[PDB]
Design a protein around this ligand. Structure first.
Ligand SMILES: Nc1nc2c(ncn2[C@@H]2O[C@H](COP(=O)(O)OP(=O)(O)OP(=O)(O)O)[C@@H](O)[C@H]2O)c(=O)[nH]1
Ligand SMILES: [Mg+2]
Ligand SMILES: [Mg+2]
Lengths: 71, 97, 81, 312, 48, 97, 98, 33, 94
RNA sequence: ACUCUGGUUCCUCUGCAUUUAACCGUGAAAAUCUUUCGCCUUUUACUAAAGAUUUCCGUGCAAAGGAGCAUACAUUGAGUAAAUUUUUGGAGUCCCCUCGAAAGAGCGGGA
């Protein structure tokens, strides 16, 4: 995890510099719990917010209408 | 008791009081008739047909090849297992039509 | 037969083998156990008697009463029956 | 050619055969084998060396095995699950030696006493710690806390029961007093696992606040018992009871992580020493081999990863 | 019961609706042995 | 080279017995407690099927069919096919009186 | 213990030291008994004070003469089985990062 | 209390539904009717 | 099992065992002579057809000769040792 | 004293049903390939035998999960309940000679 030293291309956008595997992003297999996955879909769909799906989510614990999540 | 003593020497299945069921197609109702010698008066037409049925049987039993101990491919269970087939009960002449 | 304890059954399988038995008076008889009984009366053929002084005799047959036997030495193979 | 650190057949080994989320995994203290289980309810045993063949597979739980620990002499495996039951599995027989059928809800964690008479501390969704003695059907101690308890351990002398749960505070119950002698306060969210250092001086405790805090559990401490805080791992929306464990030399600490990475921290500096990739879901349980520098990690991805690490 | 579709299938004499085994009494078997007689061989042994 | 020319029954393993094999071998030293016995008679008077019972009693895993004679001692395949004992076969067993 | 039929075997196959009414001491592997307290000792030996030893064999002691017997030594002596998985070697796939 | 009281309820509901007997390993292999 | 352990007590109303029957219920000391050439003097509180007894507050005496004796608070005596039971004239009903 | 389990009926998955004299099937199809017979102006569709493989209609058992019906704790693997000659209701005790500081031991002897 030691970062790559030196400048970065002015020409490529951040989209183009990004780590990727397919033409548009890094696809990788995953194994969630089926129950909690379904719970999070339905919270986003019905309430407007869900818990953040990212690994290494950092401070961004909630996604979507975060104002409702905190309230 | 006299009847029980009679069943012991009955033709199969009647010397059995218990067993597995068979398919209706498996039970060859007439096969005992041509296994034994043709009755003394039967026409040549019939005598030849006894031999020919006997030949089929001898050819079957000669070329048996016992059945492979292998996995049971349930076609219709694989069909029942998908959204595309449903089940019901019908009169045989309705399903036939 | 009706059930009887394993020691008596093993004694009946000791028949036909050599055995040694000591009587309550102390004499040691070695012989071939030709018969046993459920009360463990014993008939020994071909017997050698040993007195407590260490002398000995051959005896052609002996019957020893069951309640006068102190212990027997059976043969080894009976542990497999 | 490259450096090698263990008798492993390869520097990393992938162990496959589980059918569900692997919640728990532990090495035998003698170092010969390891046992792993989870949502698939079977307990799989694996040799640490050679082909790592799955030489045995215990079955019997009617629920997910939430936690699983060897007794210190390695003669028995303690396991507990969502079938409200703690079971002790005899290793030579492969059989349920005891079944402590006395919890009233899911049992989240279990820990056998390190030495002396074998006692089994257990914590449960009924809110109670219980200590079960192999010789009696009835528990020796029932410590009713008000809220569901998710993690438990004895202290090294096996006379205090340390537990944590939904209230985030760790309780320490003193088994001669039947009172909480002190509490360790500092986690922001529910505790997911507690583990006791080999020397017994320290515990770590993992929590859904994404920190591991190291606590000094010695009888006398001259001041604050909070020794330090480790960070880097993450707990996701699955809210798994991510375990934690100690290196047998205490120089290193591990915790489960939802970010797929197997984290190792150095106890003294609190720096991350390893952040190994390779899992594809929550790394629920992590442990060190007791004699040799080998890492166990058990994923929600149904994979177990064994591998060497340079424990310098 | 002689002319049911799967006779005795629901009774104690056969295992159940899968219709895999049967176990009759001698009154049953002897009545059936009589009714079959037009189809059966007279031979009592294989020596023929 | 794989000429399966088998002409007699052969057992890959020793079958289980009620007696230990070591007790049989040790009884060999004692001729008081052994007998050498012929079994004789007319054809099909039940000799081999009688030995099948002693086999079944002394060998817990010995299988007798419900509807055919095992004929353990008819080891030759021609004896299997002809249905009669053709060559004498010995059987040594330990049995209780 | 012994003859309590759920625990009939309570000392069977232990090495036991048997004292008879004549003062003899036998020692052997106690491996059968009878309702008359007859006992059968495998690999039996006798012992006397001076300690003098003699080898006997498989000894049957008529129960009438037994004073008492005691445990002398243990019986002789010599995670189960199964498995489903496999454990081929492998390596760690690098995931994405922020 | 009441904040922990709500979290105590949530954990009870989530764990019960997650580890429900009706969802344990092998179940939901539904029979066609 | 226990049926013939309960039916036993009929004959003791009249047989020679009556000296034990009176010794219990009227509480007479009895000087039970035994094998080992020892005397036991005590109050029988139970007995049976085989002549077991339980003895309270026992004095044991013998010659060893010089006289020696021992005091035993309670005892069970296996009846095969009992030679001769005597209602002791050196004691009484109590 | 330990852990071990509710009956039935049905569905579906998985595994096994080779030491075949012979038989998962007390019944009995079709194909391919190789070869040999007979039709035949060719091929297909065929005749009728051999050998080698396939497919198809079926079979058994074990184990796991589920679904319906009416409902019962025992019970499996591990392991409970006779004072009359031959054993478990006493032919038991006591006393001399011998070797040896010491305590036993002689088919020792005596009441
Ligand atoms: N009724 C009846 N038939 C029996 C009995 N035992 C044998 N059989 C039949 O008699 C026939 C001969 O039995 P085997 O055992 O072959 O007799 P065998 O004497 O050994 O025949 P060989 O040795 O060749 O002379 C078979 O058909 C058996 O089924 C019996 O006990 N009762
Ligand atoms: Mg024969
Ligand atoms: Mg052309």
């Amino acid at each position: 995890f030691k970062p790559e030293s030196g400048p970065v291309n002015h020409f490529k956008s951040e989209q183009q510099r990004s780590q990727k595997n397919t033409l548009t992003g890094f696809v990788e297999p995953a194994h969630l719990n089926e129950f909690h996955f379904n719970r999070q879909i339905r919270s986003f769909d019905t309430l407007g917010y869900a818990q953040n799906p990212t690994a290494e989510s950092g401070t961004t614990h909630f996604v979507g209408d975060v104002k409702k999540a905190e309230a | 008791t006299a009847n029980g003593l009679a069943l012991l020497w009955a033709p199969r299945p009647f010397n059995l009081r218990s067993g597995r069921t068979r398919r209706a197609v498996d039970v060859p109702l007439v096969k005992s008739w041509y296994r034994e010698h043709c009755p003394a008066g039967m026409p040549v037409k019939v005598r030849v047909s006894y031999q020919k049925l006997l030949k089929v049987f001898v050819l079957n039993a000669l070329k048996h090849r016992p059945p492979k101990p292998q996995k049971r491919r349930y076609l219709f269970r694989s069909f029942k297992a998908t959204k595309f087939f449903q089940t019901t009960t019908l009169d045989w002449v309705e399903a036939g039509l | 037969m009706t059930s009887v304890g394993v020691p008596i059954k093993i004694l009946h399988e000791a028949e036909g083998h050599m055995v040694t038995l000591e009587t309550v008076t102390g004499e040691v008889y070695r012989g071939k156990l030709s018969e046993a009984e459920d009360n463990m009366n014993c008939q020994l053929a071909e017997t050698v008697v040993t007195f407590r002084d260490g002398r000995s005799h051959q005896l052609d047959n002996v019957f020893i009463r069951g309640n006068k036997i102190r212990f027997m030495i059976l043969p080894d193979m009976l542990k497999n029956a | 050619t490259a450096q090698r650190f263990s008798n492993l057949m390869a520097p990393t080994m992938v162990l496959l055969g589980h059918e569900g989320e692997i919640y728990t995994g532990a090495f035998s203290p003698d170092g010969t084998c390891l046992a792993t289980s989870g949502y698939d309810q079977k307990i799989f045993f694996w040799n640490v060396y050679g082909e790592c063949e799955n030489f045995s597979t215990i079955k019997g739980h009617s629920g997910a095995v939430m936690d699983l620990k060897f007794t210190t002499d390695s003669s028995s495996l303690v396991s507990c699950g969502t079938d409200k039951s703690v079971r002790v599995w005899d290793m030579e027989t492969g059989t349920c030696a005891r079944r402590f059928r006395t919890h009233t809800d899911f049992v989240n964690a279990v820990h056998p006493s390190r030495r002396g008479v074998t006692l089994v501390a257990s914590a449960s969704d009924d809110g109670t710690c219980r200590v079960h003695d192999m010789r009696t059907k009835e528990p020796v101690k029932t410590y009713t806390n008000r809220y569901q308890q998710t993690a438990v351990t004895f202290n090294d002398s096996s006379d205090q029961v340390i537990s944590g749960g939904i209230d985030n505070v760790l309780k320490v119950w003193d088994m001669r007093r039947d009172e909480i002698t002190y509490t360790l306060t500092g986690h922001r969210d529910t505790i997911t696992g507690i583990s006791l250092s080999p020397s017994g001086k320290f515990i770590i405790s993992n929590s859904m606040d994404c920190t591991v805090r190291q606590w000094d559990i010695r009888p006398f401490v001259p001041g604050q018992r909070s020794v330090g805080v480790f960070a880097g791992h993450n707990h996701n929306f699955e809210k798994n009871l991510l375990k934690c464990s100690w290196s047998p030399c205490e120089r290193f600490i591990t915790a489960g992580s939802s970010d797929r990475f197997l984290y190792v921290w150095e106890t003294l500096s609190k720096k991350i020493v390893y952040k190994l990739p390779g899992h594809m879901g929550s790394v629920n349980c992590t442990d060190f081999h007791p004699k040799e520098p080998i890492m166990l990690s058990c994923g929600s991805d149904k994979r177990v990863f064994l591998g060497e690490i340079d424990m310098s | 019961w002689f002319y049911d579709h799967k006779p005795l299938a629901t009774t104690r004499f056969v295992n159940g609706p899968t219709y895999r085994k049967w176990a009759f009494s001698i009154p049953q078997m002897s009545t059936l042995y009589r009714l079959a007689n037009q189809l059966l061989t007279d031979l009592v042994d294989d020596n023929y | 080279p794989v000429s399966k020319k088998k002409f007699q029954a052969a057992e890959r393993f020793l079958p289980e017995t009620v007696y230990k094999k070591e007790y049989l071998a040790d009884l060999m030293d004692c001729p008081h407690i052994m007998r050498n016995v012929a079994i004789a008679g007319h054809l099909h008077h039940g000799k081999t099927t009688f030995l099948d019972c002693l086999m079944e009693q002394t060998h817990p895993e010995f299988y007798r069919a419900e509807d055919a004679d095992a004929r353990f001692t008819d080891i030759l395949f021609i004896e299997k096919q002809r249905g009669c004992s053709i060559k004498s076969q010995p059987v040594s067993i330990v049995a209780q009186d | 213990t012994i003859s309590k039929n759920n625990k009939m075997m309570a000392h069977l196959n232990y090495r036991m030291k048997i004292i008879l009414q004549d003062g003899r001491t036998f020692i052997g592997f106690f491996k059968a008994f009878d309702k008359h307290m007859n006992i059968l000792l495998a690999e039996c030996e006798e012992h006397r004070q001076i300690e003098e030893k003699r080898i006997l064999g498989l000894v049957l002691v008529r129960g009438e003469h037994i004073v008492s017997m005691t445990v002398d030594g243990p019986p002789p002596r010599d995670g189960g089985a199964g498995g489903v998985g496999q454990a081929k070697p492998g390596g760690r796939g690098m995931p994405a990062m922020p | 209390d009441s904040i922990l009281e709500e979290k105590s309820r949530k954990w009870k509901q989530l764990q019960g539904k997650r580890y429900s007997e009706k969802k344990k390993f092998g179940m939901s292999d539904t029979q066609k009717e | 099992a226990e049926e013939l352990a309960a039916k036993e007590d009929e004959e003791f109303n009249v047989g020679p065992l009556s000296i034990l029957t009176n010794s219990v219920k009227n509480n007479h000391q009895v000087l039970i002579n035994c094998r080992n050439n020892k005397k036991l003097l005590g109050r029988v509180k139970a007995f049976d057809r085989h002549c077991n007894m339980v003895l309270e507050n026992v004095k044991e005496m013998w010659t060893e000769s010089v006289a020696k004796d021992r005091f035993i608070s309670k005892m069970f005596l296996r009846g095969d040792s009992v030679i001769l039971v005597v209602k002791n004239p050196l004691a009484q009903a109590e």
